[PDB]
Structures are given as C-alpha cells and as structure tokens.
Design a protein that fits this description.
The PDB classes it as ribosome. This is part of a larger assembly, with chains A (164 residues), B (191 residues), C (122 residues), D (35 residues), E (138 residues) and F (117 residues). By secondary structure, chain B is mostly beta strands. Helix content of chain B is 5%, strand content 13%. Classes of the chains: A alpha+beta (164), B mainly beta (191), C mainly beta (122), D little secondary structure (35), E little secondary structure (138), F mainly alpha (117). Chain B binds three RNA strands through loops.
RNA sequence: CCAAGUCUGGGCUAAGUGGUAAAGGAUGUGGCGCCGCGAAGACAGCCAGGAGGUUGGCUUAGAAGCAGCCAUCCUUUAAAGAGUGCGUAAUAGCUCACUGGUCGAGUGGCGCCGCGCCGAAAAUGAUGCGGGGCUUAAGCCCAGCGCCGAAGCUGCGGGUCU
RNA sequence: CUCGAUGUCGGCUCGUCGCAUCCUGGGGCUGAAGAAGGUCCCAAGGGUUGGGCUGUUCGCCCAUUAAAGCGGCACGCGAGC
RNA sequence: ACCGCUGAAAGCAUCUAAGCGGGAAGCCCGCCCCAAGAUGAGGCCUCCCACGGCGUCAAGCCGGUAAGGACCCGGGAAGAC
C-alpha cells in the first residue's frame, strides 16, 4: 500500500518489475507466486493468499516495492565510521584505499551499481541504488576491517558505542 | 601431440656454483601427427603419410604452436623449455618384476630370535575373524618395473644443440638411459 | 647418526670425557645427531669431578662424526672420531676451551663461540 | 551453548527460529543461547 | 507388582525415614496444589528430598501440605551371586496410583508459593502435573 | 543420432515418479522410449533434503566402488531401472529406454547438476 | 518392481516425520474458552515530566528499588510506582509498572486441544523392502465407494473310509 | 549355536574402520587486550616419536614433541611367527 | 560451525521460508595412477578391396591381399611360464 512518485516507469512482466527513473535505473524481480499490483498512479499489495502466511509474503513485497521506488528515484546511503587511532582512509583509484596496520592496506571496488565516498579520510560511506545491495557491501567492508570493540577503534556501523 | 618428449640420456652433476647433479635427455623434433580438436564432430588423429622410411615396417598453446611445427612439414625442435624451467617427465618404471612384500612395499620382517630362523620375508597378516574374508586393501607382491612412473617440480636448467638435448635438475627419470622420457611444467607450484 | 646410546668424547673441557646419546634434538620422529645438530644425552664418565661429573643429565652438539658429511661443495669430510660439546640451553658451550678441529657447519647453525676456540675448523 | 535446555536471560534475550532451530538471542555475549 | 515378605517377617513396621508432611500456611478458599498421573514406587529418598527442597526455596505460607509416603521396598545383591537369591532390603516408597492428590500449595493470594511448588515439581521425577483446586488458585 | 519415432516423449515439471513408472510400463510390454528434458523434470519440493537423498546416490562410494551417476540423464537411469528387475528383458529393458538433456530429437534439473548435473 | 482405484469426500502436514526413544524446551502451525479495550479512540512507533516524606532496619566500612536479612506505608498534586531493572564507593543518569497531539479498527493474555522441530553420538558402506513420494504426490485422522488375494468357501469330476 | 571340538593372555606384523578430536583447521565464549590458557559448537585429513622396569596391557620413570587420543572388529588376527 | 545484508507474517525487531553473500588441513575439481570385459564394447588416422564353387534370408565350406600378423631363430633392468 504505497506510491510511485515522479518518473517511476513501471513494467511488471512474467514476474519481473522494471523500474526506470532518475539516478535509479533498476530492473528487479517480483514473484509470480502471488498477485501484482499497479495502476499507473499508485500500486500496492495483491492477496494471492490473504492468509497469514503469504499474507506477510507480500506484507514484505510492499517494502520490496517501496524499494524499487525510493531506490529508482533517490538512491541509498550507508553511513560508515572510521574510528582508528592509526587506521585511516581516503579514496584512491576507482575504489577505496583503507589502511589499518598489517602492512598491505587494500583497494576495494564498488562494481557497477555500488559507489563509495571519502567525505573525509576518517569517516566514509556508500551511496548505491538498492538499500539491499548497499547495506550488504556497505558492511561487507565495515567488518572487512576488524571493528574489535576491545576498547574502541575500527570500522563500525554508524551509531555504536564502547566496551570495557 | 600436446606436450614434448623423448628418452633418457643419463645422469652426472658437476660444476654450477655449489655444484649440482642432473640428467641428459635426447630429442630433436619427433615430427607432428595431426592435433587435438573435437570440432563439427569427433576429431583427433589423422595421418597424411610423410613419416620416416621404416615406420611402415609397422604401418591451446602446447598443441597450438604445434600447428606451427606440425604443419611446417612434421618435426618440431624441442627446448621452448629454456634456462631454468619446470616441465614434468613420465618415465617407465623398470623391469624390476615380481618381488616379496619386502621392497615392493615397505614393511618390517622377521625380527631377531626369528629374524633369521631360516625364517624371513613374508607379510604379517590379512583380515580378522568376524570382519569378512578379505579387503582389496593390503597390496600384494604387486609386480613393479613396468609402472608408468613420473613426477613433478621437474626443473630444467639448460640446453644446447649438437643434437637437440637437455640438461636436467635432479634426474630420477624413472626408466633407464635409452629410455622413454616425456616431459611437460604442469600445475607448477614454484612457478 | 649418533642416537640411542652411541658414545662420543669431549674436545672442550666442560669437565667431561664421553657422553651417551639419548635423543636427537629437534622435534618428534627425527633419528639423527650430525655435527651442528644438538643431542640429549649424558655422562658415560667425566674427569675427577671437574664441574660436570659422571652420569650428568646433559645437552651437547655435533662437531665430530666419522659418518662423513657431504659438503654442498660436492665435497666430502669426516673424522677419525665422534664427539661434541656440552651447552647452556643457550646453544652456549661450557668447556672454556676446544680440542680437535671441526667444520664450518657450527657457524651455519650457530655456535661461533667454539667456531674460533677451536684449534682448527675444517 | 547449552544445546539442550535454553530459556531467556536478560529481560529481553529473544526467541528466534533458524532452521526450525531455536537459538537464544539478546544484547549480550552472556546469552549466546543455542541448542 | 512384586511387593514385600510381610509386614513383620521380612521388613514391615518402620518409619521409612523421611521429613514429615505439612508446611506453608493455611487459607479457606484458594486452592493451590500439585498431583501426578505417573505410576511408580515413588523413590522414597528422591521423595523425602524433593518435597523438602521445596521448603528450601520458599519458607512459610503456601499448604506445603503433601499427601504421599512410601511404606514397602525392593531388594537384591547379597550373598552368593545371582541364583537362589535370599534378599537384602533397601529403598521403600509408595505407589503413586496413576495420578492423584499430590501435595497442596493452598492459600489465599500467595503464588509466591505457587512458583515454589512449581520449583517443587521441576524436581520430583515422574513428570508431574501442575494444577489448581476447587475454584482454581485465586 | 536421429533414430525411430517409436516412443516419442519428453519431460518437465511433471512428477518424477509414475513418470518413469509407465515410461517402463511401456518400458516393459516391449517398447523403446526416447525422450529428454532432464532439467525441466520435477520432483518433491523440499529441494534441500531434496538434493540430499540423491547425493546419497552422490558419494555413496563403496570400495568395491559405487559410482552413482552425476547428470540428470542418470537420476532417471536409477529410478526407472529401479522399476524393473535384472534378468534379460528387464536389462535389455534398460537399453531400450533412453533420455537426454536439452533436445536432440523432435524441479527436475537441480539435484543432479547439484550432485553433478 | 508384483495382481489390483496416480477412487471420490472433508480435514491436517511444509519436517522426509513417516522409515524406532524418554525428562526437558520454544508469540511453529491449525481448531476451541477467558481479562482489558479503539471515539475514559486500545499493545509495539513518536513529543515530554521520566513526582515528593520515600536517601526506612541487619550489615554500614556501602542499601539509600539497581550487595543481600526484614518493610511495604504516607502524601501536596497530572499518579501513585512495597521505585522488578545497567551500574559504581554508597550518592549521582536512563527504564516502564503513567498519558496529550499525530495516527486509527482489531491488540496483549492463560486454560483446551489435534499435527510438528532441538534433545537423539559409532565403529565394512549406504538405506522407506527397493526405485521412490510433498493439497489422487504421499503420510496421518474421520467418511462412501469398487477391484485384488489361501490350497479357505462355491462349480466341475474322480478318490476314499465311517 | 560350538565338547565328531571356535587354539585362550601379552607380543609381532598387516591394518581397518568410529568420534564423544590428542596434534591438526574453522568457529562462538571468557572473569579474553598481548601472549599464552580455559569453555563449547563443526570438522576426521593427515599425523599422534626412543628408552627404562615389568610375561604383561596398565602403569610409574627417563629425553623429545604440535601432539605424544578414546574405542571397534571373536577386547582383529596360530592354518602368519 | 560459524558471521552478515535486504525484509514479511508480529503497523515496531529478526541471517529468514522465499532473495543475495561471508567462512573451513575438510567434500567436488584441480595435481599423479589405472581404466570401456563402463556386454552403452567409444574417437580418430593409416593401410587392405570384392576370390572360388556348391539349393538361399547358402552372415556355410576353398585361394588369396605380408594391410597384415605369426609361428621358429636372435636378442633385451621384459621378464617364473
């Protein structure tokens, strides 16, 4: 039960939903094992089960959709924290070049779609087009570089804490 | 023919800087017989006679560059194998024959107080009571001397022509001088 | 070479004479004490109580073995004898002095200490 | 850990189902409940 | 149901050794209690115990009453080996006739004692049934 | 390649059961059934434990051996062949049936492949 | 595989349970009763003050809910908090056990069940009997329907003793 | 079942499974910083040493080591000692 | 095992049923060693050409083709034969 604001070109064929937009050129999939919902100026959930089970099944799609959109129009952002009294980073090459001891930093690449940013060496973060494909990779590096909370330092999901 | 190969020269070491023993290997270009491809259908080996004079007494790089020498007319000088390299060779065991479970297969024999007792050579046992008759496990006097032996990390040091021949890093060609040697540097690790 | 209870004299003065070879030092398996190597044996007998004393738990190394040592120099070397030197956990001799020569070796596996004390290192 | 016999620590430690499996969860290394 | 040799020739006339009945406190209505369904020469000891640990965790008002009590017993190894077995006693109890009035957590509003007994069941052995009485438990 | 047109069939979706069942059925009587489809095929949901059982055909290796095919092709091999015995006819009855992957002549593609497909 | 309904009816399984196991667990799932409310516009979102005499007794060197043994009451007022809770040396912050605007139509609780997942580790190699089977797949429960199948019982005919 | 007979302890050799795993990797836990330990979940590949004294296994002792495993199969093996 | 992402049913959370990834001396592959007698006898190249007379679907009896092979001899780290 939602919307499809400005530009959300929508094509639901075979079970795939093709969503074209601004900086959100995206082609996602969407179950044939249920009921589609689209009307050119809105859209929503289809009850191919109406029953608790599948109920949620779409009770998820809903979001799903919600994603396509917000994703197709305004892309996503993951806020990362560079907390290292030694570690540090600042883009380099078509990827990131973080560092945190060891000896060999590392170059990480946001394959077509994903795209990282070095607002300022210390902190960084990613802006993709699919919260999905984002949060993941976004993190897949947030760890990539041990956050070790033994006493405070390392890559950490924005809004963390400490320890003892 | 996908590879490169010839026979055992022999062994001897000598020189270097610390010194080192290898082995000699004979083989110019033993001509080029067709070439491997399973195209349009089943393709593998042809034969547009162009061989020796006797032979009718019995009448994609590796293989590729081949095309280079196998279409030249037949032969194909050996030696990309250059200065400091790792092919691999597959000798032919050595008519050693049918022997006792002794050398054939590592094993301790007739001990002392009975390590002689006109006693001696002969395995210890087979299978328990309940288990079941026998296993295809424990080898046996599994003849040897004929095995299609070979190995790995086969480093070649140098070569020269006067007679197309190769010098080797540690021999153990398996089979004996005048023997059938085929080399390669397969999935090398020292790479 | 040189294990179980093969015996070998001293060349240093630690206060020894000869020593039985318990273990070849290094790690599991292993079956051999070849000069440079380090042995886990004891006194078969030692002077009149210099400082060591007969039957004393010990630690010694390799420097004289008629087993013949093949020098990377495709060369060959051996001795009329088989014995070595005691040591202080810290691969460090005791004998204040040396005796029969020895072989580069040592150096290669740490010991100078004797390396030079030695009357002659072959 | 306890594989067998898990039942709610912290006044939160949740009840989750992974692989039909039931493994305790709650904001504490001191709860890593699993069976 | 093998039982013993007689009430005064083999082993009959004891105190069975245990820790008496009543505990907790009164209570006119509130029916708070425990019973079973399992059959078993209720493991004396195990028994005695159990119930007790019950008080161990509570203390005062909650009919810590309990309507059980063994009074016969088994026997086994003593003498030759396995054959013609004489008899050496040990371990009396009582048949928990496939369920019945166990002990009572009886009192007005004092679940602080219900949980107790509860702790009492946990223990025990043969499963146990958690229940209430005429009215329930308040 | 090309053959007759005797037992002209295929596969896909259906229930990888009675499926073969008759296959033979006519596998018996005295007929040749050359079809194909493998992948398309079908069989019990519970994929997972789905791909297990037949991986039980997978590494079921007994010194004495115990291959256990690794392409749809088989799956049907077993099964079917299962329907029959092993004296003459049966046997032959196993040469008389034949299937294949995509298409040579005018959930059933995962367990295999999975364990070999 | 081997003869006989991939019968029909209406439930229940989403683990291959079926194809061995107990105590002991858990908003699994499906069907039954209870306490409180949604126009004192309800549980989990969000704005805010997160009340005072409560800082009582053993031990105090520290109970002063947030060491533990006993209390469990009073209040001026929007009600309450015998202050269940993370702590520190006791004190010192948050958290509901409280409700306005913005939502708005079903939200939390225990008893009764029928199905089901962790506990449940083994020695040659693997197992429903085998191939196999997930709303006739098939399992399991309750309903009607017709076919199989003994040397048993009818038909055929002979045998034989009382 | 076997007395018209299955030759029994330990050793030797040749081993083969198994996992409740000793060494070994992977993990989560800790009253874990490091390092090293403890706790428990996943994995058997490979591997898991010389002597001593004892008929012994077991076991204690000596020097190692990453380690110096528990147990199957008539507590495997006498038509093999 | 073990760790995460995207998100239902529980309008708040959740590695989760469905969607996507992380992660082991371990499985599969890869590296060597066979090996279609795997009766599903596999591929391919390079040779040989239609001989005789007899009743038959004579797919049966003879010269053959050194294509070709053999046997006997002489020899081999090939080897009991």
């Amino acid at each position: 039960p939602i919307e499809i604001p400005a530009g959300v070109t929508v094509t639901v064929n075979g079970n795939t939903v093709t969503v074209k937009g601004p900086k959100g050129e995206l082609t996602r999939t969407f179950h044939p094992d249920m009921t589609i919902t689209v009307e050119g100026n809105v859209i929503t959930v289809t009850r191919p089960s109406d029953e608790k089970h599948h109920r949620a099944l779409h009770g998820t799609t809903r979001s799903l959709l919600a994603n396509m959109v917000e994703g197709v129009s305004k892309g996503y952002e993951k806020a990362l924290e560079l907390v290292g009294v030694g570690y540090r980073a600042s883009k380099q090459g078509k990827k990131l070049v973080l560092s945190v001891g060891y000896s060999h930093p590392v170059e990480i690449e946001p394959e077509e779609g994903l795209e990282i940013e070095v607002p300022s060496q210390t902190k960084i973060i990613v802006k993709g087009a699919d919260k999905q494909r984002v949060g993941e990779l976004a993190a897949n590096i947030r760890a990539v570089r041990p956050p070790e909370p033994y006493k405070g330092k390392g890559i950490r999901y924005e809004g963390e804490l400490v320890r003892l | 023919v996908q590879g490169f190969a010839g026979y055992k020269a022999g062994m001897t070491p000598r020189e270097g800087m610390e010194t080192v023993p290898v082995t000699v290997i004979e083989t110019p270009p033993m001509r080029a017989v067709a070439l491997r491809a399973y195209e349009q259908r089943p393709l593998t080996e042809v034969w547009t006679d162009e061989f020796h004079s006797e032979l009718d007494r019995t009448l994609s790089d590796r293989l590729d560059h081949a095309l280079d020498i196998v279409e030249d007319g037949g032969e194909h000088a050996m030696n990309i194998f250059r200065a400091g390299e790792y092919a691999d060779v597959a000798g032919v065991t050595k008519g050693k024959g049918t022997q006792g479970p002794v050398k054939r297969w590592g094993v301790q024999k007739r001990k002392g107080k009975h390590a002689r007792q006109g006693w001696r050579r002969r395995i210890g046992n087979l299978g328990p009571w309940n288990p079941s008759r026998v296993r295809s496990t424990v080898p046996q006097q599994g003849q040897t001397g004929y095995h299609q032996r070979t190995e790995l990390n086969k480093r070649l040091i140098d070569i020269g022509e006067g007679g197309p021949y190769t010098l080797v890093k540690g021999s153990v060609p398996g089979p004996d001088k005048r023997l059938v040697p085929f080399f390669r540097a397969v999935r090398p690790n020292d790479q | 070479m040189i294990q179980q209870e093969s015996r070998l004299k001293v060349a240093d003065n630690s206060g020894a004479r000869e020593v039985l070879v318990i273990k070849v030092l290094g790690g599991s398996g292993r079956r051999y004490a070849n000069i440079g190597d380090v042995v886990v044996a004891t006194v078969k007998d030692a002077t009149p109580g210099g400082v060591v004393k007969k039957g004393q738990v010990v630690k010694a190394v390799v420097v004289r073995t008629k087993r013949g040592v093949r020098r990377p120099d495709g060369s060959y070397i051996r001795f009329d004898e088989n014995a070595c030197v005691i040591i202080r956990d810290d691969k460090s001799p005791r004998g204040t002095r040396i005796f029969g020569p020895v072989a580069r070796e040592l150096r290669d596996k740490d010991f100078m200490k004797i390396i030079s004390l030695a009357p002659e290192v072959i | 850990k306890v594989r067998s016999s898990v039942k709610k620590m912290c006044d939160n430690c949740k009840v989750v189902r992974r692989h039909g499996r039931v493994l305790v969860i709650c904001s504490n290394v001191k709860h890593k409940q699993r069976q | 149901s093998i039982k013993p040799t007689r009430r005064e020739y083999i082993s009959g006339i004891p105190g069975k050794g245990i820790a008496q009945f009543k505990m907790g406190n009164n209570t006119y209505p509130a029916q708070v209690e425990n019973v079973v369904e399992k059959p078993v020469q209720i493991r004396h000891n195990a028994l005695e115990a159990a119930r007790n640990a019950a008080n161990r965790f509570v203390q005062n008002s909650g009919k810590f009453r309990i309507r059980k009590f063994p009074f016969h017993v088994i026997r086994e190894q003593d003498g030759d080996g396995m054959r013609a077995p004489f008899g050496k006693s040990v371990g009396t109890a009582a048949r928990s006739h496939g369920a019945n009035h166990d002990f009572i957590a009886w009192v007005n509003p004092d679940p602080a004692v219900e949980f107790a007994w509860r702790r009492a069941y946990m223990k025990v052995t043969p499963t146990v049934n958690i229940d209430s009485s005429p009215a329930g438990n308040a | 390649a090309e053959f007759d047109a005797d037992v002209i069939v295929d596969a896909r979706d259906c229930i990888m059961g009675r499926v073969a069942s008759q296959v033979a059925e006519q596998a018996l009587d005295g007929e040749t059934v050359a079809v194909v489809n493998a992948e398309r095929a079908v069989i019990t949901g519970r994929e997972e434990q789905i791909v297990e059982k037949y991986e039980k055909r997978v590494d079921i290796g007994n010194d004495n051996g115990y291959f256990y095919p690794k392409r749809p092709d088989g799956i049907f091999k077993r099964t079917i062949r299962g329907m029959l015995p092993k004296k003459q006819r049966g046997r032959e009855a196993f040469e008389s049936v034949r299937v294949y992957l995509g298409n040579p002549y005018d959930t059933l593609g995962e367990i295999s492949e999975t364990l070999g497909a």
